[PDB]
Structures are given as structure tokens and as C-alpha cells.
Design a protein around this ligand. Sequence first.
Ligand SMILES: *[C@@H]1O[C@H](CO)[C@@H](O[C@@H]2O[C@H](CO)[C@@H](O)[C@H](O)[C@H]2NC(C)=O)[C@H](O)[C@H]1NC(C)=O
Ligand SMILES: *[C@@H]1O[C@H](CO)[C@@H](O[C@@H]2O[C@H](CO)[C@@H](O)[C@H](O)[C@H]2NC(C)=O)[C@H](O)[C@H]1NC(C)=O
Ligand SMILES: *[C@@H]1O[C@H](CO)[C@@H](O[C@@H]2O[C@H](CO)[C@@H](O)[C@H](O)[C@H]2NC(C)=O)[C@H](O)[C@H]1NC(C)=O
Ligand SMILES: *[C@@H]1O[C@H](CO)[C@@H](O[C@@H]2O[C@H](CO)[C@@H](O)[C@H](O)[C@H]2NC(C)=O)[C@H](O)[C@H]1NC(C)=O
Ligand SMILES: *[C@@H]1O[C@H](CO)[C@@H](O[C@@H]2O[C@H](CO)[C@@H](O)[C@H](O)[C@H]2NC(C)=O)[C@H](O)[C@H]1NC(C)=O
Ligand SMILES: *[C@@H]1O[C@H](CO)[C@@H](O[C@@H]2O[C@H](CO)[C@@H](O)[C@H](O)[C@H]2NC(C)=O)[C@H](O)[C@H]1NC(C)=O
Ligand SMILES: *[C@@H]1O[C@H](CO)[C@@H](O[C@@H]2O[C@H](CO)[C@@H](O)[C@H](O)[C@H]2NC(C)=O)[C@H](O)[C@H]1NC(C)=O
Ligand SMILES: *[C@@H]1O[C@H](CO)[C@@H](O[C@@H]2O[C@H](CO)[C@@H](O)[C@H](O)[C@H]2NC(C)=O)[C@H](O)[C@H]1NC(C)=O
Ligand SMILES: *[C@@H]1O[C@H](CO)[C@@H](O[C@@H]2O[C@H](CO)[C@@H](O)[C@H](O)[C@H]2NC(C)=O)[C@H](O)[C@H]1NC(C)=O
Ligand SMILES: *[C@@H]1O[C@H](CO)[C@@H](O)[C@H](O)[C@H]1NC(C)=O
Ligand SMILES: *[C@@H]1O[C@H](CO)[C@@H](O)[C@H](O)[C@H]1NC(C)=O
Ligand SMILES: *[C@@H]1O[C@H](CO)[C@@H](O)[C@H](O)[C@H]1NC(C)=O
Lengths: 49, 424, 163, 197
Amino acid sequence: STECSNLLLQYGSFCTQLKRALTGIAVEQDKNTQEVFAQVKQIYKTPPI
Amino acid sequence: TMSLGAENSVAYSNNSIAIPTNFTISVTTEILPVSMTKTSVDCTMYICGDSTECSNLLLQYGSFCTQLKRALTGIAVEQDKNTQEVFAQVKQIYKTPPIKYFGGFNFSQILPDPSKPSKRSPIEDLLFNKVTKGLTVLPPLLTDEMIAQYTSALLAGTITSGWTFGAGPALQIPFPMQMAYRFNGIGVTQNVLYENQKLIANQFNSAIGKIQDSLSSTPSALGKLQDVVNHNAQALNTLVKQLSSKFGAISSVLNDIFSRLDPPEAEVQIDRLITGRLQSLQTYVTQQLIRAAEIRASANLAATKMSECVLGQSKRVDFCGKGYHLMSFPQSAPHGVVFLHVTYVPAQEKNFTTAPAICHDGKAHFPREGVFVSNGTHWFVTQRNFYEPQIITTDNTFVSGNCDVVIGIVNNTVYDPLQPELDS
Amino acid sequence: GTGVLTESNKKFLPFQQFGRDIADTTDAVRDPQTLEILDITPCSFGGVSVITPGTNTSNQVAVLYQGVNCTEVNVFQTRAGCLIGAEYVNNSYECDIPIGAGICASYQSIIAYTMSLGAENSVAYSNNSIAIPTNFTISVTTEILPVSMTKTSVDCTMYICGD
Amino acid sequence: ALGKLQDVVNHNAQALNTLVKQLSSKFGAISSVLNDIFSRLDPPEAEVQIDRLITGRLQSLQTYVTQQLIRAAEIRASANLAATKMSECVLGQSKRVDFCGKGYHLMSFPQSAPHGVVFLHVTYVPAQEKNFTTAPAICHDGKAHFPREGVFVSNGTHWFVTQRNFYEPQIITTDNTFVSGNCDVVIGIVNNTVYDP
Ligand SMILES: *[C@@H]1O[C@H](CO)[C@@H](O[C@@H]2O[C@H](CO)[C@@H](O)[C@H](O)[C@H]2NC(C)=O)[C@H](O)[C@H]1NC(C)=O
Ligand SMILES: *[C@@H]1O[C@H](CO)[C@@H](O[C@@H]2O[C@H](CO)[C@@H](O)[C@H](O)[C@H]2NC(C)=O)[C@H](O)[C@H]1NC(C)=O
Ligand SMILES: *[C@@H]1O[C@H](CO)[C@@H](O[C@@H]2O[C@H](CO)[C@@H](O)[C@H](O)[C@H]2NC(C)=O)[C@H](O)[C@H]1NC(C)=O
Ligand SMILES: *[C@@H]1O[C@H](CO)[C@@H](O[C@@H]2O[C@H](CO)[C@@H](O)[C@H](O)[C@H]2NC(C)=O)[C@H](O)[C@H]1NC(C)=O
Ligand SMILES: *[C@@H]1O[C@H](CO)[C@@H](O[C@@H]2O[C@H](CO)[C@@H](O)[C@H](O)[C@H]2NC(C)=O)[C@H](O)[C@H]1NC(C)=O
Ligand SMILES: *[C@@H]1O[C@H](CO)[C@@H](O[C@@H]2O[C@H](CO)[C@@H](O)[C@H](O)[C@H]2NC(C)=O)[C@H](O)[C@H]1NC(C)=O
Ligand SMILES: *[C@@H]1O[C@H](CO)[C@@H](O[C@@H]2O[C@H](CO)[C@@H](O)[C@H](O)[C@H]2NC(C)=O)[C@H](O)[C@H]1NC(C)=O
Ligand SMILES: *[C@@H]1O[C@H](CO)[C@@H](O[C@@H]2O[C@H](CO)[C@@H](O)[C@H](O)[C@H]2NC(C)=O)[C@H](O)[C@H]1NC(C)=O
Ligand SMILES: *[C@@H]1O[C@H](CO)[C@@H](O[C@@H]2O[C@H](CO)[C@@H](O)[C@H](O)[C@H]2NC(C)=O)[C@H](O)[C@H]1NC(C)=O
Ligand SMILES: *[C@@H]1O[C@H](CO)[C@@H](O)[C@H](O)[C@H]1NC(C)=O
Ligand SMILES: *[C@@H]1O[C@H](CO)[C@@H](O)[C@H](O)[C@H]1NC(C)=O
Ligand SMILES: *[C@@H]1O[C@H](CO)[C@@H](O)[C@H](O)[C@H]1NC(C)=O
């Protein structure tokens, strides 16, 4: 609904706040995975035997 | 597709060991946020400004204003508590000797500068340079000068007294002997420190200079503290921006509502503006509480690092820098602490042929503190973290059992110190 | 609105009437009768904080006006604001009531002071001397840690609507 | 002394008292009593007034749940810390500085408390320190001797080796020292005899 969006614009930057918080959580999850698993900068390999 | 890293196939075999023949004194930086901006919001002035009728209507909502003020007050006292926990870990203000010679070790970049009015270190001064309506910002309880004084006291204690001041009275010890104690902590004998004292001092000075250059040359080094400042400022800006939102009313200005509409509809319009502004303020307070919890966790971690890396030597892997931890130095930073972790990194490793035990006289000998290595023709025992080959004797080995049980035992002679004495 | 109308150094363009700052609040205006520019500085708001000991002990209070200079309101100027009713003492004690910017208040009348960080100790460092303990103290210290809270359940229908 | 636990009890009681107090708020309606609203207005406008009350009370309840969840996260972090202290200070001896009391940690005792745990940390604090003249190594027979586990001290005329955390002087022998290199490299080496058993 275009009229609903026009009425929704009157409420300000609530939508921007919610998107920014979700973006912060989204980058935080990748940072968490990077901190836990990427603790080595060399990819070691086991011997064949 | 992102590259995880360089492939490194380690040459594992059942009888070969790699022993370091050299070391690098590496100083690394760890930046931890400690406190946030202390914000106080006047609920009446934010929601209503100066309108008396708006305040009268606002009184009907009860203790929302008290809840928001109480939550912000809790966050504000929490920030001061966080700073107090991280930096005020000593009750004695220690001072360095006037003759600042510590065995070839240079601490000019981290000790306070007498020439500067702020009494800060060159590194701390660089850190401070590199970090840049009903609403008020409260000053922190501890000023930058007092936090710098606390860091100076911690540096003086950790330089002149080692880790003794953190566990009781400060006991003076020469800095090379302290560095030898720290070498013993990571399993390297003190002779390695004493013989290479000039090289270790030069490496430490070079690393400290590299740290200052690296901080001065990288814009994104101090992003973690900057983000906190940015998050606080942006949140404050957004909260004020919410005042310019109609929230589904004819106008965002209360006076326009009083002048343009009758009181039966005016009360509805002011109610809409009040609920919108109150919801904005509640959203801001909720964000502040979540960020305060995150900063409190970071401050607790910083206090743990201050206790375990600066006031003692830590055996925890990667807690106090990459490598075997030797010592740490605290530096004050805007809303945060920077730890300079001095660690020992092994380097210039060499292959050797290794065995679990030495078979001599039908007895199995095992190293008391080291490892058996062979350069190809001769067998020696050396400490695990530095290559220092020594003759296999009965003083650095112990006997447990015969040679029939241990898998991979090799035959070699074991010298007896007592044998030439009774022989002669 | 309500405000203090002062002379303005802001050079308006001839078509502009009102003025806004960074925070989108009306802070400049042009009088309709006179084509001069006037700043609308908001009336001198401040947070009034009351520093008091327990009412069991005394009824004396001190007033801190946050972010207000002392000439615009036992008067002391702090970076937090103006403190009235407390007398600055050049001595340093432990912090009893935190004021801010290194200032703390205590009751002994109400005094305000710069809090001491710690007792001053100079370590006798030299390159060939060590200090060895000859005795020990077995010290038992307390650490209090919260573990759980009160478990609360709320009847949503009864709270919102009752009967 | 027990301010933290009493503080938690105070926050929970204060949050409940505030939540009860919030029922006395009109929330932009004619009355804060729902029964009055029914007894006084037709359903088209009474529905609106009851709505005003319902949205205000629901906002109050969601606010209370939000602070309860934030306090739950804080208490969960404190409880995780308490479990770590119970595991590492009570069930073992910790080398972590200031984790289990001020001083060198010996052992710890747990005590139950209302909504909490009290740890009695038994620690070792050095006291009655004394100055001594110290050296990195002892030069004997052209060889450098270093302490195996202690430190070289001198009371003015005689050299001894003692453990670092307590003064117990012992004669410098080959049993408690090790030889690495000659005397030409170590900075600050002093000349003293090394006894042979
Ligand atoms: C120890 O020996 C192994 C092999 O005996 C060395 O591993 C080789 O290193 C070269 C140089 O990069 C590689 O090209 C080979 O592919 C490696 N071989 C294996 C089987 O991994 C190893 O470099 C030696 N260690 C040191 C410190 O010299
Ligand atoms: C161990 O490594 C250090 C450097 O990490 C070496 O010191 C360098 O030695 C070369 C020549 O011997 C000099 O040109 C450099 O200036 C030295 N660097 C520093 C920082 O002093 C040292 O020689 C190495 N030792 C061994 C036994 O390999
Ligand atoms: C310790 O380090 C500082 C800084 O690295 C040294 O100060 C430098 O001294 C040289 C020669 O005197 C000057 O050319 C540099 O400009 C100085 N740098 C700075 C930042 O001031 C200092 O000489 C070193 N030694 C001692 C004993 O302090
Ligand atoms: C392994 O190390 C030992 C000792 O460092 C070496 O033995 C010495 O080698 C030198 C080199 O010619 C001789 O001059 C000495 O006489 C040897 N000493 C003894 C006691 O025999 C040995 O050569 C090394 N082996 C390898 C393969 O490098
Ligand atoms: C190490 O020495 C032992 C004994 O000195 C060797 O064991 C002997 O091995 C031979 C042939 O393998 C047998 O005939 C003997 O009966 C064994 N004697 C004993 C007492 O076990 C052993 O082989 C040697 N190992 C190496 C690698 O040379
Ligand atoms: C070890 O000796 C030093 C200096 O000989 C002592 O330090 C002095 O202590 C006195 C007494 O408090 C002070 O007045 C001096 O200012 C101190 N001098 C310095 C340079 O700090 C130290 O107290 C002695 N240690 C012990 C345990 O007696
Ligand atoms: C080490 O300190 C303890 C006290 O911490 C000393 O014990 C005291 O000794 C005196 C005289 O012998 C008694 O009057 C006290 O009652 C003792 N105190 C306690 C708590 O038992 C001990 O003598 C000190 N040792 C040394 C060598 O100085
Ligand atoms: C340093 O300590 C040693 C022993 O701990 C002292 O040597 C003894 O001193 C006593 C009394 O002075 C004599 O009766 C002994 O015969 C000495 N023993 C030896 C083996 O000589 C020494 O006097 C102390 N030095 C100082 C300056 O106090
Ligand atoms: C410790 O003893 C060594 C020798 O046992 C002394 O070294 C000699 O000192 C003299 C004069 O200083 C020189 O002429 C010799 O060439 C040195 N010999 C050696 C092998 O270095 C040393 O000076 C003594 N140190 C002290 C502090 O007494
Ligand atoms: C080590 O490996 C080699 C070949 O991989 C084998 O011949 C030898 O017996 C092994 N030694 C031990 C002690 O396992
Ligand atoms: C408006 O009235 C003021 C009042 O004295 C007068 O001075 C001015 O000339 C008038 N006209 C304009 C255009 O300002
Ligand atoms: C200690 O300092 C003095 C003078 O500062 C010097 O003569 C002496 O050699 C130094 N000793 C050591 C071990 O550095």
C-alpha cells in the first residue's frame, strides 16, 4: 500500500533504527564465527601416512 | 572466493622434532573499550519542551519518566564502576626512579612525558589524538589525568617490582632478573636471557617503536573505541531527530496543535506526540542498556587482562597476545585501555632426530626437563623452547625401567659426572 | 515558543526567516517588524542534582547545577557544573559521594574535594638490589557474587484487564 | 558488605512495585478504571478508551519484560563467573592473578547466600621484606652459575641462594645451581665460591 507507506513516513526513522540494529546483529554473527574458528592464518595439513 | 590462508603442510614424522634456535620479542596491541558516554535525559523537557499543558498531560502516564531516568542513572554509575574496576587496581601510586635505566630496556614511549602538560606517554598522547533539548552528557568521574596517573602507577609497579606489587607489597627487583623470571615462566632457562640481554633489549625497543609507528600510520587501528563514540553520538542524534516526527499528527509542534484545533482533538494530538516521543525515548534507553551490557562485559574482560597480563604472567594461550606471554603494559585511551603485550615468539627452528628415551646399561633414561635431540651423529638433551644442546648425563636424566618397554628407544651412552672423580 | 532573544552574528540570506541548528531546533529568527537577526537561546536549563547525606544523619544539602556557570544561577565551579552549598577543601580523601570530573563530596558541613587515587609510594629500584620476604600473612577475603534472581510470573490478562 | 544481593532483591521488588503502580495511569483516556469506561460510554468510544488503557498497560508490561531480560543476562554473566570461580578457586588452585583474592591464591571456600554465593579466598601475602644485594650469576672457576629455582642474595659479606617468595638462605652449591658458559658474557656477574658436596 502506497498510502500506508506515506502514513508510515510520518513516524520518522524507526525503520532505519530497526534495519541498523539488524545489520549490527548480522555483522556480529560473522565476527563471532571469525573469532571462534579463524584463529590460524596458515592452513595446516596432516601427513598422508 | 575468500582465501582462508596459506597452505602449510607440516613435515610430521615419528622421529623428528623441530627446535627453535632463536626468538623474537614481539609487542602487540589489544584495544578494549571500558566506558561509554554518560547520558542523562530530562523526560519532561524532551517530550514536552516548555508547554505546561503537555507536562500536565504527561503526568497522567505515571512513572515512565522515573523508569527512564533510573535506567540512565544506572548506566551512568556503571560506566564509572567499569573505569574504577579496570584502572584502579592498585591503592598505592608507584613512581619510577629518576635514573630511568632498566638494563638496556627503553620505556620512554610508555612512561609519562614530563614535557607535556597532560603528563601522558607518547603512545597515550597518540591514542588520545587518534580518537575524535533535555539531553545532557555527564562528565566521567575519573578524568584523563587520573586514569593516566593510574596507568603510570601500574607501569611503575610492573617495571620496578615485577608481579610482586599485584599480590602484596612491591618488592624491588632488577629488570633483567625480572625478565629472566618471566623467561623461566614460559619454560626458558634464565641463562638464555642473561647471555642475550642486549639483543633482547634491542628487540623490545624496536618492537615498541614499531608499535608507535603502526598506531600512528593506520587509521583503523583504534576503530573499537571510535565505534563506541559513534554509537553514542548517532543514538543521541537519532533521539533528537525523533522530535521532528509528526507520529501521525497534523504537526510536530505542540503550539500549532493548541492554536489550530479545539481541546477535544488537541488532547488526542498531544497524546500521539507524547506516546511517540516516549516510545522513542524507551527505544533509546533499551539500546543504551544493551550497549551498556556489552561494554560492561568488555570492561570485565579488560579488568581480567589488567589483573592477569599486567599484574602477573599468564599461562593462558592467546589471552595476553600472540606467543608465549612475558609481560604487558597498560595505556589509557579515550573510553578504553590499550594493552601492549610483550610476548616471546620462537624463530629460526631447526630439524633434529628425536627419541623418547636413551638406552644405557640396560636402563631407560628420560629427560628431567628437556628433550633428546640428535644432529646426525651425536645425542644431546636440550630445553624444549630453545636450542641449547648439552651432554646427556645422569644429572639431567632420570631412570625408569629397562629398555624393553619404551617404543623407539635408541642406544646411546650416558655420561657420569662422578666417574672422573673416583677415577682420578 | 519561549526563549532568550539575543543579538545574532549569523548572516541570514534576505529570503530566510527562521533558523535551525544541527539538531533541527529553532535557534535563530528574524523579527517581522525589524529586519535584524535574533538568536533564540533556550532559557537556561540545567539539571539540579542534590547532594545529601542520610536524613538520619543531617538535613544539609548541596545543589549541583549541571553545565551552568556559577555566574548564571560556598559556591564552587566544577567541570560538571556549579556546586552551591559545599566548601572546597584542598585536602584529598576517598570518594564518598561522586560529583564528577574528579570532584567528590562528603559530610564531616558538606565538603567537596578532589579525590585521592592512593597513598604515594616510591619503590626503591636499583640495578643490583632485591627485596625478599621474610614472613607471610594468611589473608582470607570475601567475594560476593549474585547467582539467581526472583522468578516472576505475570498473568497478562489479569494485569491488563482485571475482572 | 552484602550490597550486591540486596541490590538484586531491591531491583526485583522495585520493578514489581513500578509495574503495579503503572495501573494508575490514564494513558490518555478519561479514566484509569476499565469498569467506569464500560459504565459510562457507548461501545464505539468506550472501545477506543479501553484501547488507550490496553496499549499503555501492554507497553508497561513489555518494558518490564525487557528490563527483566537485560537483568537476566547480567545475572547469567555473574552466575557464569561464579561457576568459573567455584571450579577454579574452590575445586583447584588458580595461578590467575586476582581471580581468587588479593595475593597468591592458596584455596577457597564456598558459602551459600540469598540469591548468591560468597567465596572466602584464602591467599598467601608476603610480608616483612628485607633488602639484599643481588646478582644474576656467580662466577666460579671461569664458569657462570645460575640458580635452578631460587635467586642469589647477599647480606653484605656472604652470598647465598634463596627461594624467591620466602627468605631462606642456603649455601651456593652445585646441587642448586647450573653452569652455562663462562663469566665474560653475563652482565653483572660477581665472584664467589661454589661449594661442591
Ligand atoms: C625439516 O625437514 C622437512 C623434510 O624432511 C622439511 O620439509 C620440507 O620443506 C621444503 C621447503 O619448504 C618443502 O619444499 C618440502 O616439501 C618439505 N617436505 C615435507 C615432507 O614437508 C622442513 O622444512 C625441515 N624443517 C626445517 C626447519 O628446515
Ligand atoms: C637471532 O636473531 C637476531 C635477530 O632476530 C640476530 O641478530 C641480528 O644479527 C645480525 C648479524 O648477526 C645483525 O646484522 C642484526 O643487526 C641483528 N639484529 C638485532 C636486532 O640485533 C641474531 O644474530 C640471531 N642469533 C642467532 C644465533 O641466529
Ligand atoms: C629511548 O628511546 C627514545 C625514543 O626511542 C630515545 O630518544 C631518541 O633519542 C635520539 C638521540 O638522542 C633522538 O634523535 C630521537 O629523536 C629521540 N626520540 C624521541 C622520541 O625523543 C632515547 O634516546 C632512548 N634512550 C634513553 C636512555 O632514553
Ligand atoms: C653434532 O654436534 C657435535 C658437537 O657439537 C659434533 O661433534 C664435534 O664436531 C666437530 C666438527 O668437526 C669436531 O671438531 C669435534 O671434535 C666434534 N666433537 C666430538 C666430541 O666428537 C658433531 O660433529 C655434530 N654432528 C654433525 C653431523 O653435525
Ligand atoms: C641396542 O642394544 C641392545 C643390547 O645392547 C641390542 O639388543 C640386541 O640385539 C641383537 C640383535 O638385534 C640381539 O641378538 C641381542 O640378543 C639383543 N640384546 C639384548 C640385551 O636385547 C639392540 O639391538 C640395540 N639397538 C640398536 C638400534 O642398535
Ligand atoms: C631498601 O633500601 C632503600 C634505600 O636504601 C629503602 O628505601 C628508602 O626507605 C626510606 C624509609 O621509608 C625512605 O625514607 C627513602 O625515601 C627510601 N629511598 C628510596 C630511594 O625509595 C628501602 O626502604 C629498603 N627496603 C627495606 C625493606 O627496608
Ligand atoms: C612472622 O609473623 C608472625 C605474625 O604474623 C609472628 O608471630 C608473632 O610472634 C610474636 C613473638 O614471637 C608473638 O607475640 C605474636 O603473637 C605472633 N603472632 C601470631 C599471629 O602468632 C612471627 O614471629 C614472625 N616471624 C618472624 C621470623 O618474624
Ligand atoms: C651473613 O650471613 C652469614 C651466615 O648467614 C654470616 O656468617 C656468620 O656470622 C656469624 C655472626 O656474624 C658468625 O658467628 C659465623 O661464624 C658466620 N659464619 C660463617 C660461615 O662465616 C655473616 O656474618 C652475615 N653477614 C652480615 C654482614 O650480616
Ligand atoms: C673476578 O675474577 C676474574 C678472574 O677470576 C677477574 O678477571 C680478571 O681481572 C683482571 C683484572 O681486572 C684481569 O687482568 C684478568 O685478565 C681477568 N681475567 C679474566 C679471565 O677475565 C675479574 O676481574 C674478577 N671480578 C671482580 C669483580 O673481582
Ligand atoms: C617410524 O616410521 C618408520 C617408517 O615410517 C618405521 O620404519 C619405524 O619403525 C618407525 N618407528 C617407530 C618407533 O614407530
Ligand atoms: C518597520 O517598522 C520599523 C519600526 O520602527 C521601521 O523602523 C521600519 O523602517 C519599518 N519598515 C521595514 C521595512 O522594516
Ligand atoms: C648498576 O649501575 C651502576 C651505576 O649506575 C653501574 O656502575 C653498575 O655497573 C650497574 N650494574 C649492572 C649490573 O647493571
